Design a binder for these strands. Structure first.
Length: 69
DNA sequence: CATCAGTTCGAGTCTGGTACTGCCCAGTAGTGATCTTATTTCATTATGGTGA
């Protein structure tokens, strides 16, 4: 899923990419890595991942190879 | 002798000792209504440091 918005990183971002994911494809990941953003340390994204049963994985700060691909 | 003092009789007046009558108010505890207040929640609002 690809999303484009003028705003800085904020949940809306996340609702969106995941909406399209669950829209044109069908479901959603199983383990979703996501750096140590704020959009990911928020309550909304974690609650949504819990609701849809996605294992949330977090790379350590300043390390980029963990999401290198 | 007839004047005044010591004696009587019965009525006037108070008072204790004993019993009794004709009459409605006052206080208290139920409810239902309508305020009233020392005290317990429902939102905004400011402060905080750091990884994308």
């Amino acid at each position: 899923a690809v999303y484009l918005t003028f705003d800085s990183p904020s949940y809306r971002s996340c609702l969106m990419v995941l909406r399209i994911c669950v829209k044109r494809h069908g479901r959603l990941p199983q383990i979703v890595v996501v750096d140590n953003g704020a959009e990911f340390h928020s309550v909304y994204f974690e609650t949504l991942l819990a609701t849809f049963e996605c294992t949330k994985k977090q790379r350590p700060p300043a390390k980029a190879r963990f999401g290198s691909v």
